[PDB]
Amino acid sequence: SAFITFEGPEGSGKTTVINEVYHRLVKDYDVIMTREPGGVPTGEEIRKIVLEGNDMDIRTEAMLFAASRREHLVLKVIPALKEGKVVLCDRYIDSSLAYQGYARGIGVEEVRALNEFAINGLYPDLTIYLNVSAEVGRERIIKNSDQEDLKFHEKVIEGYQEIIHNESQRFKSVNADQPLENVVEDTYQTIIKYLEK
Amino acid sequence: MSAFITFEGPEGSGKTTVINEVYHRLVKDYDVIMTREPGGVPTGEEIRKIVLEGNDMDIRTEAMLFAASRREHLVLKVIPALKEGKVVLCDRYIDSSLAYQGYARGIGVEEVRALNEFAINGLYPDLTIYLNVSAEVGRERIIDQEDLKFHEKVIEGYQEIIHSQRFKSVNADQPLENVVEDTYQTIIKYLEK
């Protein structure tokens, strides 16, 4: 079994990439993919509260997300990891550090603390990072379609930039400035390289 | 009247904390900025970005790219600020590459020195703070065998380096609060004199 997570900002191609990588791997591996909280009712119901949040406090927001993450972990991720499966997750801990910790201003380590509580020391065996630059990212978001969104997005990236330093044991970065056909392949090779050895 | 101040140390030495506390104490009275290579510089970014997406990339290539991204950072951000007469607080510099790449990764200190002497073109810190942390104190502030022995190699490589015109060592084995304060005193004593 293997717990492999994907992480990336707006415009990193994260959705499409993961879906496409996933259907390739299924050919050859006992592998599933899940979108946190992955239809788990308590996780989904918890999260409903943040989405329905009316200018809600970010720490309230981060705690509910961590709780929602945990429900999904314990009711879906762990049971499938226990039946030998490979498990792919659209987001996980490192997302929270980048959005809540660095971008929103709570504190990387405070949010890491929160998250260590929620996940009981279940770190991913491998994390894929979709390294997209602020400029290409911006261009993806515009392409598929104020000054707030932009600098905030530039901040998200910045935080992903810090997190990933000194965590190379589990991180591998793919180029997400490449056409999506190439982001897929490099990601798929990263994952299978990991599984083979 | 302008100061190029660098901060060296291994991970676990408090560096991150110390540089920020001290930034915040010095903004009151000095035209200070806070930077870490590649510090937002585009060319600098681009170069670094290639090493990241490296798959088992040669270590010397990696080191050259590290120097190029450094010299972009230095010439496009550090040098212009020194000229407007700023205090630039810099997180990692020449001595970082030596310990990590010269000593810890086995390339050779003199070979990394010579390459870093090319990238900075004789532009050294006016003052370099070394947060001197033991390995065992380092280890604990951090949390496998590879990383513990790599960490120890980094520290060992610094100990070789530091052996004093620009170097001052804060004892990083103190609580972080005291490492911050001694670092400050050490810096204000440089700027006020």
Can you give the CATH number for the domain in which A78 is found?
Answer: 3.40.50.300
Q: What DSSP designation does A177 have?
A: S
A187 residue type, one letter: T
Give chain B's count of helices (H) and strands (E): 9, 5
Distance from CA of B113 to the nearest CA of A (A): 23
Residue A180: give the domain boundaries: 1-197
Coil, strand or helix: which one is B168? strand
Residue with tokens 């992903």: A160
The number of distinct structural domains making up chain A is: 1
Beta carbons within 10 angstroms of residue A135's beta carbon: 11
Give yes or no for A54 touching B (CB within 8 A). no
Experimental technique used?
X-ray
Q: What does this entry list as its resolution, in Å? A: 2.5
How far is residue B38 from each of residues A55, A99, A138, B48, B86, measured CA to CA in Å?
Answer: 36, 22, 21, 8, 18
Using omega within 30 degrees of 0 as the cis cutoff, is the peptide bond preceding B175 cis? no
- The set of residues, in sequence order, having a beta carbon less than 8 Å from that of A146 and lying 6+ positions away, is none
Contact between A131 and B53 using a beta-carbon 8 Å cutoff: yes
Q: Mind telling me how many Å the CA of A174 is from chain B's nearest CA?
A: 6
Contact B108, B76 (CB under 8 A): no
Q: Which residues of A touch B53 (CB under 8 A)?
A: 131, 173-175, 186
- Composition of chain B by helix, strand, coil, percent to 5: 60, 15, 25
